[PDB]
Amino acid sequence: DSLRPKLSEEQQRIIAILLDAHHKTYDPTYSDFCQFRPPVRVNDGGGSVTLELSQLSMLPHLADLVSYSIQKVIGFAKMIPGFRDLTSEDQIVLLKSSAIEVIMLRSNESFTMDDMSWTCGNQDYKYRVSDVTKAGHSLELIEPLIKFQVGLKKLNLHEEEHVLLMAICIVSPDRPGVQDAALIEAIQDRLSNTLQTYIRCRHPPPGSHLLYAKMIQKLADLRSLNEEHSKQYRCLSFQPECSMKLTPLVLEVFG
Ligand SMILES: C=C1/C(=C\C=C2/CCC[C@]3(C)[C@@H]([C@H](C)CCCC(C)(C)O)CC[C@@H]23)C[C@H](O)C[C@@H]1O
């Protein structure tokens, strides 16, 4: 019953651009990770907040990973059709507000349900819930984050849908501080329409069933994770000497 209009050439170009953008900005071999400050995992079987905050053993490495990732997200965003049509001010507002959410989205490629980890190479760059606690975060963020990762995994997104979702996430007209909400919304609509059209004509059943709505729900989930991350980041930042364990970029985006 539902019509399946074909992707317009323009929509085809948009998909090609976003796939190219992602391939240039996401390394599925994790080959740069050895350049980050080394992961350190202190003995913390009990999950002691006092100990976690006293050491922040995993923080330098995860801060470097996140900082690196923000740089990649900036590069990806610059390639979203329409993004450069925005004022610099609006571009920066969108990047700073969406960065952590896009990181959570893009991390799904490395996430595995084999053991519920982000596996980015050997035992060294395998990141578990216990590694995030060692960077000063609490289960109130990490457990819904893992749940989100599983939920996202199970949508079995085509890469086309994955890159569209990240672009839609970034170009959101409802971020605090945006100037030209109408232009951002127009850019987002073009992407949303591409995604909806793609799903309807290129995504096989039964995985296509209400997929667009499930993807929109993930965006809402990300808002919640963003809010919790920000709250926890604030508290983490109270730890004396914490700034040294972060990066200038991380400090700007989250401070
Ligand atoms: C980054 C990427 C990756 C994994 C993401 C992870 C695993 C470690 C813990 C992270 C980084 C989460 C953690 C809660 C962020 C903590 C950030 C600070 C600044 C400490 O408050 C969010 C996403 C998680 C690897 C992937 O290949 C690239 C992706 O950008």
- Three-state secondary-structure class, residue 78: helix
Ligand 1, atom 29: closest residue by C-alpha: 107
Q: Are 91 and 170 in contact (CB under 8 A)?
A: no
Q: How many CB atoms lie within 10 A of CB 219?
A: 14
Domain ranges within the chain, ordered by starting residue:
1-255
Experimental method: X-ray
CATH number for region 1-255: 1.10.565.10
- CA–CA dist 211, 217 (Å, integer): 10
The type of residue at 201 is C
CA distances from 155 to 108, 150, 209, 212 (A): 11, 9, 10, 10
CA distances from 74 to 14, 77, 80, 186 (A): 18, 5, 10, 20
- CA–CA dist 243, 248 (Å, integer): 8
Residues 151-155: contacts with CB under 8 Å, at least 24 apart? 151/218, 151/221, 152/105, 152/108, 152/111, 152/218, 153/108, 153/111, 153/113, 155/207, 155/211, 155/214, 155/215, 155/218
105 ligand 1 Cβ < 6 A? no
Resolution (A): 1.9
Atom of ligand 1 nearest to the CA of 142: 14
63 ligand 1 Cβ < 6 A? yes
Going from the Cα of 66 to the center of ligand 1, the distance in angstroms, rounded, reads: 5
Specify the DSSP class assigned to residue 39.
Answer: P
The type of residue at 150 is V
